Design a protein around this ligand. Structure first.
Ligand SMILES: Nc1nc2c(ncn2[C@@H]2O[C@H](COP(=O)(O)OP(=O)(O)OP(=O)(O)O)[C@@H](O)[C@H]2O)c(=O)[nH]1
Ligand SMILES: Nc1nc2c(ncn2[C@@H]2O[C@H](COP(=O)(O)OP(=O)(O)O)[C@@H](O)[C@H]2O)c(=O)[nH]1
Ligand SMILES: Nc1nc2c(ncn2[C@@H]2O[C@H](COP(=O)(O)OP(=O)(O)O)[C@@H](O)[C@H]2O)c(=O)[nH]1
Ligand SMILES: [Mg+2]
Lengths: 427, 50, 48, 89, 50, 426, 426
């Protein structure tokens, strides 16, 4: 049972730069790459006293990639994986999908080919990218397209980073986001949205760090992913693999967008503070003050929820907890499903990273649900997309690259169809 | 500041929506239960007369 | 009637106690001075 | 009720498609009939502060509770004052 | 004006919440009375059988 | 002589069977290395029902583990009494179904079921006279329900004359693991009512409630729940493995408890079950066991039997007892609560006595009741099935694999006619 | 054979019962670990009245502890002879009523009485031929008075033909611990006049006076008072457990003492009670016992009988005594002070002899007199009840909980006709 992880764009490989640091520490691998069977799902044992990740960083600008090449993880991250282009897509979906994709995607998927042939029990792929940028959106969609036509039946777990409504670093993010979803809809099987402003508020409120950088963000992103694959990496009382989300969380072939959350995101002094048990973290996983997307789940009705439990938990109290949640009436469910839960329990507690701001906790919960607040998110992005598109702003860059208005309009009405789909299902 | 207050009000109203919906569902279930109550009364009367 | 839940005093085969009583005693006897049941007519399970 | 028959007749004459829904755009044509030019962002606010249960659209029940509330006594009377004008004339 | 509107809508929302809580209490009452009535009907069934 | 092979499916089935083979080996006195170390001779004559002598006192169980994910098999070999199975009996897939009944019944079955059929065949003709088959599995999971269900169908087609026991847990909304519980349970039950001879229904909700109230445990892990189910399974099969003053075989219990070919869903209890703090303060008499046995809060289903009637009932006792006391206790229970029994069948209680108690106890019992309160469970499930199916949720992960819609309507109709005929005979 | 189920309610009842079971176990020679260590066979043949053997000489009391604050349970388990009760009989709430009769009768009763009824139902069906029940409780508190009252009412409506003893301490103005003493006593007495067959009025005032004058104790804690009350209760039921020249069971004593269905409030005493300093200067004869029995200062109630008349009286003697001496003494004490006895009833004294003295005495006695002076105690309480009820002090705590005012009017009216008919027969 093995799963490979590809990273697209500037944000994706920074996430991976934190993720694999967490992985090698969790499996006791020094950054040079050797230990002083559970690792087999991420690391292949070459020769003697060496392990190499099942991953490929890829990006168009060489700055961030060769910073990985020269950093502390020279020996661990292997030479061929780190694919780097010569020049950026420059926040231009057309430039990252039609000009430079045509030269880089074949080299990438030919690497993925020999990676899958090295693997034996491939569970699925999982991609890391942000759709606001050019490289993450454009060749990310192009790659996912060629991965779908090549394998198709294998699960594809897409952990995307959407632009925040009020916090924004770029300008053409609406154009690139919409053009990303136009392919993300019919290519990814299981796609999890993670905003930035929510993580800012989480680090501000619970972690009480006044001045956070991207490092702490990516640190807790790795915590979430590691807590999601812990069921495969280690045995538990009730294990749940990568194919179960495919079944238990996606009621329709076009409704796959999952809100994720994590608990307890706590500081060092506050672990000393509070008495921790299952009931309060099961609660705190449902407040919007602890979700990974800046959206209000009270505005929406849940479709299905999944609960990853790590550490020292029995099935008794977690079953009692979800009982209290199901009988609470602050939050409601759809009338379509009576049993809207999918639990999972693993024995190994979450590990800590030196320099990280989380305390070592006895037990933690990773929630992944499905709601209609996402349907509100896409409308919020759609509104500011049409505001800019109405004046034909910035269109000449994409047209000069070689695209037209047809895919603009059809992606616009494609999101409109997605809006209608959500409004119909939520009823 | 006006926009902040407006957003807060909008949130409050959108939660009021959820509250009235769950109220409606609970009322449906309560009506079904009182129907069951009346049925049990009728069954008891029948057994007593028998 | 005589057999009841939760009391292990008077569960012996004989109604009375042979140790300190005559039949029709209706006095309490402990479980220690109470007879044991016969399982079957032949007493062993072996094939030499 | 003797005011309320004409209230609901005023409501459907303000409406054009005849349904429960009235949009700010129909409100713009009503403003054109009144004669004074509304602001750029005024008519959305006027509909938003009164539309309470549903969203975007305004409903007959919403109009009704708004009317009896604004009949009573520091309260937004945005759309109330203008319909009252229709009631007066 | 918007401040006062918020002050009003908060009270209305709290009223809705308390109505929901009362509905839950009535749910519990109705469930208990249903259980007792079913028990009574089973008793009457035993009586008429005897 | 009379032979019972064991078939374990899915994760729950494997962990239940692990505890089951631990307690059976404990009863027959064989150590976890596979050799005999008992004291009494009574254990030797009836190990041929559950074992095969290999070489020099090496008794391997007549078991077949079957699933699709190596985690469960590793957890089997990890714990004690895992070194005694035959590695060839570890018939085993590689992909994994994962809560998808269509995966467990149409795609992965086509390449696993021929192999499991090979090994279960070879293990069937390895012995002389089959009594029947014994399958432990779930109705919520994918690799347990679907694969085990097709296995039942294939087996009942090849050996239609042998008995068959199915210990199947059912899901409940109060202890709910997954989301597709009704889509799995409805289809499996739909197939079990035409294939299986009888089913012993279990559920985790009643077990948790038992360990809370009667056992008064603090942390009811899965180990103790599987421990209770194992004690139940040893209790129902003790008649063949040991002599007694009145012997009741499997077919004997079936013909005593099954009045109609579709009325074969049993609810089970177990006695004695006492808390450790009160373990020495209690007494051991047949009335004491009977009071705990006929209690409604001791059933291992989420079906209050006082909301219906017992069609029939059975109690298998273990220990030195007087059958006169046994029969008068059954008569007292039938005479006092005469409303809770059916009218048109007199003497609704079958009994049996075996003279060997379980290890550590002086006297135990095992209750098996075919009541009509089970229709509450199936209505409770079928209504969730209709709630999801009426708006076609989650339907496409099944229709996209080979299943069609009329199968779901078939399971609906079969579930509905079953519960209606239960309501009829009530 | 004849059976007595013991029920303890409230803090007063539980601690009294704790010393009670200590004394009883001492008399039957069973050590606090629950095994037999006596010497004669006379102790064995009548422990089915009070105990049930669990397994191998482990005798457990037939008692039910019932309260709402775990501190009493802790104080029970902490002391010796604490590990003998069955943990299942520790039926027990969690909130606490706290001197609120409505809390003990309407709020917590509704969810605690069902469970305690199931426990006492199992304890009563565990025995064959009920003689009656024995309920120790208080009248001042809430969880003892109101709860025990509801339990008595439920039991009387279920087992109407069985006897019932209740030992109730009553409040006094001189020993006045709580403040709603009249509000609790009046309602409880109003219910004990209709439900309970007979009760024994006790009070802490007379007990303190006894420990000061006769015992000449320095620090009369609650342990010694409960020791006295325990000795009296043991003296009452000595007749069922040990044979004598003249048996007098509970029902036999009831019919000998109760002339009219409402005249069942008895003042009780106990002899001998002498200080260890003066036990050397005393003798041990039946006159020596009797002239301490009929002493006014030896009654365990604050109702001096020389303010009224005796209706009936009983004496239970224990030890190898001469029945002529017994009867000539009852005749002499009836002829000397003839005015204090009722006129239209000849031979107002029932007597009885048992041949087994308590451990530590050669010859003992127990006086149970049904006088008419108890109208003084009820008058003393009813006037405090009216004094508060005249302008509704403390009333909202009860009326706001479900009770109404006409219950109080009913209670005082029943108290008033009770006292007036005692005065009538005087
Ligand atoms: N959470 C998080 N987001 C990041 C991080 N780095 C970049 N981003 C997001 O990435 C978006 C812009 O895209 P980039 O990742 O900078 O670069 P790109 O996606 O490859 O697109 P190009 O700049 O054209 O190459 C910004 O809106 C950021 O929000 C990071 O370390 N953590
Ligand atoms: N009693 C018991 N039940 C279990 C155990 N493991 C899982 N279950 C139940 O089985 C259901 C899930 O079945 P699963 O093991 O996933 O079936 P599978 O995926 O087909 O192998 C859950 O509802 C659990 O309640 C166990 O060890 N003991
Ligand atoms: N003899 C005796 N009386 C007690 C003891 N504890 C409390 N009391 C009496 O009980 C009365 C108060 O009633 P209480 O015990 O609180 O009743 P409850 O609250 O219902 O349990 C006081 O007047 C005390 O005199 C005790 O240990 N021995
Ligand atoms: Mg970039």
């Amino acid at each position: 049972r093995e799963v490979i992880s590809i990273h697209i764009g500037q944000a994706g490989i920074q996430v991976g730069n934190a993720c694999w640091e967490l992985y090698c520490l969790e499996h006791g691998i020094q950054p040079d790459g050797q230990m002083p069977d559970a690792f087999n799902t991420f690391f292949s044992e070459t020769g003697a006293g060496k392990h190499v990740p099942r991953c490929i960083f890829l990006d168009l600008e060489p700055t961030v990639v060769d910073e990985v090449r020269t950093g502390t993880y020279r020996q661990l991250f292997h030479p061929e994986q780190l694919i780097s282009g010569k020049e950026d897509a420059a926040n231009n979906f057309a430039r990252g999908h039609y000009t430079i994709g045509k030269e880089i995607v074949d080299l990438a998927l030919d690497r993925i080919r020999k990676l899958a042939d090295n693997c034996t029990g491939l569970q699925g792929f999982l991609v890391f990218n942000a759709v606001g940028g050019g490289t993450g959106s454009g060749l990310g969609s192009l790659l996912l397209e060629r991965l779908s036509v090549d394998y198709g039946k294998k699960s594809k777990l897409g952990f995307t980073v959407y632009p925040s409504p009020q916090v924004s670093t770029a300008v053409v993010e609406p154009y690139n986001s919409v053009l990303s979803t136009h392919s993300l809809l019919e290519h990814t099987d299981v796609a999890v949205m993670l905003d930035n402003e929510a993580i800012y508020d989480i680090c501000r409120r619970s972690l009480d760090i006044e001045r956070p950088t991207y490092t702490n963000l990516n640190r807790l992103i790795a915590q979430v992913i590691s807590s999601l694959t812990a069921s495969l990496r280690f045995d538990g009382a009730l294990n749940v693999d990568i194919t179960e989300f495919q079944t238990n969380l996606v009621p329709y072939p076009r409704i796959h967008f999952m809100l994720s959350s994590y608990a307890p995101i706590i500081s060092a002094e506050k672990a000393y503070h509070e008495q921790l048990s299952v009931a309060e973290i099961t609660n705190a996983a449902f407040e919007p003050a602890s979700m990974m997307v800046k959206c209000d789940p009270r505005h929406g009705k849940y479709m299905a929820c999944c609960l990853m439990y790590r550490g020292d938990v029995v099935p008794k109290d977690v079953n009692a907890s979800v009982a209290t949640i199901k009988t609470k009436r602050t939050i409601q469910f759809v009338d379509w499903c009576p049993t809207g839960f999918k639990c999972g329990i693993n024995y190994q507690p979450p590990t800590v990273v030196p320099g990280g701001d989380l305390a070592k906790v006895q037990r933690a919960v990773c929630m992944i649900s499905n709601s209609t607040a996402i349907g509100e998110i896409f409308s919020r992005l759609d509104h500011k997309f049409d505001l800019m598109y109405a004046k034909r702003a910035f269109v000449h860059w994409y047209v000069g690259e070689g695209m037209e208005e047809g895919e603009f309009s059809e992606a616009r009405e494609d999101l409109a169809a997605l809006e209608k789909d959500f409004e119909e299902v939520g009823a | 500041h006006n926009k902040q207050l407006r957003e807060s009000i909008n949130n409050l109203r959108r939660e009021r929506i959820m509250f009235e919906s769950i109220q409606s569902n609970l009322e449906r279930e309560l009506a079904k239960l009182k129907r069951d109550m009346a049925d049990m009364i009728q069954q008891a009367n029948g057994a007593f007369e028998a | 009637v005589h057999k009841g839940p939760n009391q292990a005093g008077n569960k012996g085969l004989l109604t009375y106690n042979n140790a300190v009583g005559i039949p029709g005693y209706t006095g309490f006897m402990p479980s220690t001075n109470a007879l044991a049941l016969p399982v079957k007519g032949f007493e062993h399970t072996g094939r030499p | 009720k003797n005011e309320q028959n004409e209230l609901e007749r005023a409501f459907n004459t303000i409406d054009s498609k005849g349904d429960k829904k009235i949009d700010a755009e129909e409100l713009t044509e009503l403003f054109l009939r009144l004669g004074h030019k509304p602001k750029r962002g005024e008519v959305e606010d006027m509909i938003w502060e009164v539309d309470e249960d549903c969203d975007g659209c305004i409903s007959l029940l919403e109009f009704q509770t708004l009317y009896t509330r604004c009949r009573d006594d520091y309260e937004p009377r945005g759309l109330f004052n203008v319909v009252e004008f229709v009631m007066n004339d | 004006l918007y401040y006062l509107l918020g002050e009003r809508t908060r009270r209305e929302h709290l009223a809705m919440d308390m109505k929901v809580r009362a509905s839950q209490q009535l749910k519990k009452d109705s469930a208990d009375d249903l259980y007792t009535l079913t028990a009574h009907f089973n008793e009457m069934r035993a009586a008429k059988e005897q | 002589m009379r032979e019972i092979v064991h078939i374990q499916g899915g994760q729950c089935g494997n962990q239940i069977g692990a505890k089951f083979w631990e307690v059976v080996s404990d009863e027959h006195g064989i150590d976890p290395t596979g050799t005999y170390h008992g004291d009494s001779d009574l254990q030797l004559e009836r190990i041929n029902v559950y074992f095969n002598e290999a070489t020099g006192g090496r008794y391997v169980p007549r078991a077949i583990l079957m699933d699709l994910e190596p985690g469960t098999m590793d957890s089997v070999r990890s714990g004690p009494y895992g070194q005694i199975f035959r590695p060839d009996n570890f018939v085993f897939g590689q992909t994994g179904a994962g809560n998808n009944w269509a995966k467990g019944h149409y795609t992965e079955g086509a390449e696993l079921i021929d192999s499991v059929l090979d090994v279960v065949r070879k293990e069937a003709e390895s012995c002389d006279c089959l009594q029947g088959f014994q399958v432990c599995h779930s109705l919520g999971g994918g690799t347990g329900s679907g694969m085990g269900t097709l296995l039942i169908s294939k087996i009942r087609e090849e050996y239609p004359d042998r008995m068959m026991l199915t210990f199947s847990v059912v899901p409940s909304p109060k202890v709910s693991d997954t989301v597709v519980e009704p889509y799995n349970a409805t289809l499996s039950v739909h197939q079990l009512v035409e294939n299986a001879d009888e089913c012993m229904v279990l559920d985790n909700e009643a077990l948790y409630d038992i360990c809370f109230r009667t056992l008064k445990l603090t942390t009811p892990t899965f180990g103790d729940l599987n421990h209770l189910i194992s004690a139940v399974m040893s209790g129902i099969t003790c008649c063949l493995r040991f002599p007694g003053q009145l012997n009741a075989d499997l077919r004997k219990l079936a013909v005593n408890l099954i009045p109609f070919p579709r009325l074969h869903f049993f609810m089970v209890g177990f006695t004695p079950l006492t808390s450790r703090g009160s373990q020495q303060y209690r007494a051991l008499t047949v009335p004491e066991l009977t009071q705990q046995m006929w209690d409604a809060k001791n059933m291992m289903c989420a079906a209050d039997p006082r909301h219906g009637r017992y069609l029939t009932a059975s109690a298998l006792f273990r220990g030195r007892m007087s059958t006169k006391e046994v029969d008068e206790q059954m008569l007292n229970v039938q005479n006092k609560n005469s409303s809770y029994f059916v009218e048109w069948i007199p003497n609704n209680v079958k009994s049996s006595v075996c003279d060997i108690p379980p290890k550590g106890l002086k006297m135990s019992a095992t209750f098996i009741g075919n009541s009509t309160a089970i229709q509450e469970m199936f209505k409770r499930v079928s209504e969730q099935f209709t709630a999801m199916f009426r708006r076609k949720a989650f339907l496409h992960w099944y229709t996209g694999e080979g299943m069609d819609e009329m199968e779901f309507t078939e399971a609906e109709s079969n579930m509905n006619d079953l519960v209606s005929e239960y309501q009829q005979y009530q």
